[PDB]
Write a protein that binds this ligand. Structure first.
Ligand SMILES: CCCCCCCC/C=C\CCCCCCCC(=O)O[C@@H](COC(=O)CCCCCCCCCCCCCCC)COP(=O)([O-])OCC[N+](C)(C)C
Ligand SMILES: CCCCCCCC/C=C\CCCCCCCC(=O)O[C@@H](COC(=O)CCCCCCCCCCCCCCC)COP(=O)([O-])OCC[N+](C)(C)C
Ligand SMILES: CC(=O)N[C@H]1[C@@H](OP(=O)(O)OP(=O)(O)OC[C@H]2O[C@@H](n3ccc(=O)[nH]c3=O)[C@H](O)[C@@H]2O)O[C@H](CO)[C@@H](O)[C@@H]1O
Ligand SMILES: CC(=O)N[C@H]1[C@@H](OP(=O)(O)OP(=O)(O)OC[C@H]2O[C@@H](n3ccc(=O)[nH]c3=O)[C@H](O)[C@@H]2O)O[C@H](CO)[C@@H](O)[C@@H]1O
Ligand SMILES: [Mg+2]
Ligand SMILES: [Mg+2]
Lengths: 694, 694
């Protein structure tokens, strides 16, 4: 058909039996062998059923779900969320867009990447829905490798219950049809290629209004997708995101794990403070698991082009934003949408839309997950700060350009703070432990020495294992390191409290620690989600030194993933002379000798790119360590500086502590207080504006 | 023939033309397809021509030449050296073993690691000799992969001149026949497998008296092989080696390179001191490039068995020595032969036999070469010290057992010194630079701070690049680091000389530095090779800090090399319906659905061994760094110890320097003087004994 392989094989008699409990699209399942590039779907005469009926279907919302090639449970969770949202949107009464036939304006796209990696349970479930069936998959046509397989069905069944082991599929008068579209790549290309298929491929044929990106295992709420869609009423909005919640399992059983409570508090703090503060200015960065939506006309053009391919202008050699730009290629979309030329798109954060995802529960996978977040956030901030002049070439008004400039400066200020945390934590810890020892003398001298040595044995080992080993290989040591750092944090808290109490008895750390805690709590109260402030808060404080001295070290030590004529067969069962008298010459005997006597008379692009990536990774690490030690040696007078000053004075001996320690200790808490104040003000403005608009 | 593939195809008419300038073996070149394991050559009915004549040939000396890339010129020099020695031995008149037919008692075996890797120029050279010709190589026989190809010829031509670009081959009345035997493995197995073929394979058929190991590119002297053979007159000798000389090129042009003069001095010091002294005690090890010889009956049995396969007693898990035995596998033979049960074999060092090899001239390949020497020497010393009790289970007399015990203790003492060199160098450097600054105040304060920072920026970078990067990628930085370390060594020498001169003017470092230099020079004079003591000595002193702070770091950071349903090709040009009406059942439509609904109703040994190796590498590194810093912090009172002592005294402030620095500084030079004295006495005893015996 039209030069492409197609097939319409009716779904199982069983499925068809319940579907009737009939128009044409419910009854056949269509297959399509896509053998072109994603950016060629329209010109290759490839189409989708939405475009073939008597009246073509104008789609309003395209839900792209990236199959995790994982257990059906996660995918079933995502699909159940989507079907619940669609049912809500078809039961809506007073609405111009959604109605009893909105099931026709929504398309679900499941871009599975591993044709072999895909879990059998997923295909088994997808088959139950009727959007897949085995048997007709041509791995080669016209002597050309088919790039992916497209199966299209409109199933009338919905998942209504998902226990710990089963998904309940039923077909009643209350179920709604859903337009599935199962894409299935055949070879392991990364997530950016899945997005390339979603955006440059099927979105070019369907022409949606909004394009929503989901993952496998992310459950949207009963009402989340509709609330995210409502954000695009304002014609200026070019993107949006929602809240991310850690799901705690049956009656919050997972809170007993101390690595899940930490992430619960971290997620809810992030959503309450950072997302609202950024959304006030107008530029936000979708969280890794946060469900996102992009108005199609907004991302179309330059944003997509530099998200997929990167900076085109590049010679044969490599460049920081021409060979390393991909590091922030994702957040590039947000950076490119906001700063589009002659266009005033803004990014908005929706709090009425949430999605509950599952968080890692062991330290190895936690470290491996955060390795991609930290590198992405660091490179994205560097790039956005370096290219802030683009804000003044866009189409915004003067006030919105000024606001965006201020936000970019503040974001780079936060990045600069996070870069020096390695030295800041050690400086605070050492100054505090030596000050209390020097003031009270009781047993804190030996504790100071012991804790200095414990930190050094855990920092050195973390560097070495992150540079050479893998987290899965050594999990017990990482658990031990986290426990040791938690004990050090307990001791630091004890020193601060104890000296503050004694100073109160005798008559700033107490002043700030209370201010930032109260700002946190007041923001939580205003956001109307205050239970995290006590339920899962302590574990965040104890596993906070391990977020500054383990996740950062591994993230920086693993910036890029660097992966560095036969003939002659004789076998005669009867020992027969197959060659016999043949292949027997006297002139050839001289030919080989003459030829042999006559003889006696940079590697590929991959290794070059790998070398460049390794050099970048080892230059970043070295600069990080050197600058942090520069700060430490300037403050504590380590590195032989105190020796040098003593020698100049002789031209004496080293004192125990100086006023530089006090000055630095005050500066750090002032910075912390300023950051907390800024984020509190941002959250307050967000809630006030939202309330007035509502 | 006998169930194995053979072929006797006369050599080129050209070759045969000069050979006559005729008995049977000169005129045919025999091929053999070896399809068995090395330890099965005799039982498989595989033989070599030496065993087929009317009277079998009892071989007296078997020479093994290992070739991998099989570069030409290098192989040409190796063959020319062997040819010269054989012709000299045949010329020898007053000898029972050697005479006009001495060549028949010597067999030359050339084993190539990979036919794909062998250099075409070499194979061509081999063809010129007539021991190889292309065309009849069966990569498969009897449905079994042939393990290696054996070509056997007895050529009458010799190489008589090797210019920089040509090898001069002539056939006169003065040339001697040589019994070549070209082994050619087909896939890249390592050098230990080449030795397994040499020892468990063809040596089992030939039954030689002495087995000599050479490496392509190494040139034995005009008389070296005979002088090495003469060492086995003493029935107690079980092995032997000779001197290694760096060849300096045409009129010593290569001495202008400062990385070649350093290795020249290092090699000649090693041969003069360490070999002679070790030879005195016995159990004299062999240098990596040093040509070696083993009496066949000596190595046969337990030594070979534990050299090739390692410790047999082992469960499914890993053990340290068993798994890491390969690190000391080559230096297992020497340890095994000496300590053989009920046998009194000794190892002797022959100075009358030498061989000139080529040394690396760039820093990357120099580091990569020394990475295998340092690891081998470290593991061999550890194993030999751990298993010294085996000396008292052998057959030696009481005095020789005592001597071997003493030698093992002294060798581990040297290894223990070499383990702490990282801290020793820094301690000496820092104490010296702070002492001169503290005494004279002029400009040495800033120099002390500058040099402390330069060392730390070059040590940190060396660790990071050795752990993450590769030497070839960053050569300029390694050159810069070596230059910086040479400048630091110049400054240390200046400080020592300057303070010693001022102290002489006012009235131990001078005392020792002169004693060790004089012992070096007197040993060189007694060994009668004194030109190195001035020609290539200074460059060794300047590139000595880079041998302690670059080669060691890279060697320890790279202990082990850790390398972590197609169907439906439907392409009908005429749009032919291959399935057509067929493949249109309806019962199958239900079968897949039912099966799919029913579904919805540790890695391999390699990764485990790799994980173990990485863990061993990262535990060794950590222990090395920790112990060296323990020494440094105890001496200099770093690591917060001085702070702790000051706090106890308060229960004051840190002084600049203590008496621990003086005590340590004296202890180090005492150790150096003791080592120099021991090696001088050993060399003197060696020369005196050799002179009296001669
Ligand atoms: C440094 C500047 C560059 C930093 C670059 C880069 C960042 C690294 C900074 C590390 C902390 C340095 C702190 C410091 O002052 O060093 C001290 C120890 O000096 C040493 O032993 C350090 C030697 C360099 C180690 C560099 C790390 C490489 C990995 C590990 C390599 C192996 C490590 C072990 C090698 C034996 C200085 O000693 P001191 O104060 O002069 O002693 C007198 C003290 N007193 C006054 C109380 C009496
Ligand atoms: C340590 C024991 C365990 C060693 C374990 C293992 C071997 C490593 C030894 C390094 C040398 C230590 C020397 C030393 O005393 O440290 C000093 C600096 O302290 C630091 O800044 C060191 C922090 C630990 C770094 C460990 C290396 C990991 C790689 C790099 C990781 C990133 C490195 C940068 C992080 C910001 C101690 O400071 P101080 O003397 O208390 O200050 C007052 C000085 N005064 C008296 C003159 C006023
Ligand atoms: C290197 C690594 O170990 N990554 C970890 C991390 O990354 P992290 O969670 O960032 O990444 P994910 O693998 O979860 O990727 C998110 C989306 O990408 C799809 N998709 C598609 C193609 C592809 O190559 N990769 C891919 O991830 C995923 O199923 C999902 O749809 O998260 C999890 C920890 O809880 C673990 O699964 C992993 O240990
Ligand atoms: C990892 C590495 O880079 N090794 C370096 C080093 O090791 P090094 O000199 O120790 O090792 P060599 O490669 O020279 O080995 C010696 C003998 O082994 C043969 N043989 C056989 C099989 C095999 O796998 N390997 C093998 O070496 C060799 O040709 C020779 O006959 O020496 C040289 C430096 O001047 C360089 O060639 C190399 O850069
Ligand atoms: Mg997931
Ligand atoms: Mg070589």
């Amino acid at each position: 058909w039209n030069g492409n392989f197609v097939f319409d094989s009716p779904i199982s008699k069983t499925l068809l039996d319940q579907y009737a409990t009939l128009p044409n699209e419910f009854k056949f399942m269509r297959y399509q062998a896509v053998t072109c590039e994603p950016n060629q779907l329209a010109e290759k005469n490839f189409t989708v059923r939405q475009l073939k009926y008597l009246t073509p279907r104008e789609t309003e919302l395209m839900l792209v779900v990236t199959m995790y090639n994982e257990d059906h449970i996660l995918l079933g969770r995502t699909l159940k969320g989507i079907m619940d949202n669609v049912k809500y949107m078809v039961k809506k009464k007073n609405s111009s867009t959604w109605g009893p036939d909105a099931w026709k304006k929504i398309v679900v796209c499941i871009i599975s990447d591993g044709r072999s990696k895909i879990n059998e349970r997923s295909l088994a479930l997808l088959s139950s829905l009727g959007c897949y069936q085995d048997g007709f998959a041509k791995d080669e046509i016209n002597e050309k490798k088919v790039a992916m397989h497209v199966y299209e069905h409109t199933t009338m069944i919905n998942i209504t219950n998902i226990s710990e082991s089963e998904v309940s599929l039923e077909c009643n008068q209350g179920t709604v049809p859903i337009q599935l579209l199962f894409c299935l790549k055949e070879q392991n290309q990364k997530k950016i290629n899945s997005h390339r298929w979603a955006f440059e491929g099927f979105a070019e044929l369907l022409r949606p209004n909004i394009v929503t990106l989901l993952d496998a295992g992310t459950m949207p709420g009963k009402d989340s997708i509709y609330q995210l869609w409502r954000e695009f009423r304002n014609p200026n909005v070019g993107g949006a995101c929602g809240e991310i919640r850690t799901d705690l399992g049956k009656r919050f059983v997972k809170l007993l794990n101390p690595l899940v409570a930490s992430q619960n508090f971290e997620y809810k703090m992030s959503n309450i403070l950072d997302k609202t503060t950024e959304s006030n200015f107008g530029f936000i960065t979708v969280l890794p698991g946060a469900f996102s939506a992009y108005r199609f006309e907004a991302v179309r053009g330059q944003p997509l082009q530099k998200y997929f391919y990167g900076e085109i202008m590049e010679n044969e050699g490599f460049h920081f934003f021409s060979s390393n730009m991909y590091l922030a290629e994702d957040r590039i979309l947000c950076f490119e949408v906001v700063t589009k030329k002659n266009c005033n798109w803004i990014l908005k954060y929706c709090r009425s839309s949430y999605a509950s995802t599952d968080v890692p529960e062991r330290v190895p996978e936690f470290i491996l997950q955060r390795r991609r977040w930290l590198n992405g956030s660091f490179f994205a901030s560097v790039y956005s700060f370096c290219h802030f002049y683009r804000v003044w070439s866009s189409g915004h008004n003067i006030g919105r350009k000024l606001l965006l400039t201020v936000e970019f400066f503040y974001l780079f200020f936060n990045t600069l703070i996070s870069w020096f945390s390695l030295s800041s934590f050690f400086l605070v810890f050492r100054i505090l432990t030596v000050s209390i020892a020097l003031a009270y003398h009781s047993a804190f001298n030996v504790l100071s020495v012991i804790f200095l040595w414990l930190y050094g044995i855990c920092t050195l080992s973390t560097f070495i294992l992150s540079l050479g080993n893998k987290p899965k290989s050594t999990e017990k040591f990482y658990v031990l390191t986290c426990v040791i750092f938690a004990v050090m944090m307990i001791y630091m808290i004890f020193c601060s409290i104890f000296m503050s109490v004694k100073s109160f008895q005798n008559i700033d750390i107490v002043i700030s620690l209370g201010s930032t805690y109260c700002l946190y709590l007041i923001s939580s109260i205003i956001y109307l989600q205050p239970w995290h402030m006590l339920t899962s808060f302590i574990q965040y404080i104890l596993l906070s030194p391990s977020y500054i001295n383990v996740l950062n070290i591994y993230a920086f030590c693993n910036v890029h993933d660097l992966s560095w004529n036969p003939l002659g067969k004789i076998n005669t069962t009867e020992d027969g002379t197959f060659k016999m008298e043949v292949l027997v010459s006297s002139s050839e005997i001289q030919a080989n000798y003459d030829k042999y006597l006559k003889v006696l008379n940079e590697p590929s692009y991959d290794e070059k790119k790998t070398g460049y990536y390794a050099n970048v990774r080892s230059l970043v690490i070295i600069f990080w360590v050197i600058t942090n030690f520069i700060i430490v040696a300037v403050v504590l007078e380590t590195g032989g500086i105190a020796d040098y000053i003593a020698m100049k004075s002789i031209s004496a001996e080293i004192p125990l502590m100086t006023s530089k320690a006090s000055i630095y200790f005050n500066v750090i808490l002032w910075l912390v207080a300023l950051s907390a104040l800024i984020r509190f003000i941002g959250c307050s403005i967000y809630m006030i504006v939202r309330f007035f608009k509502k």
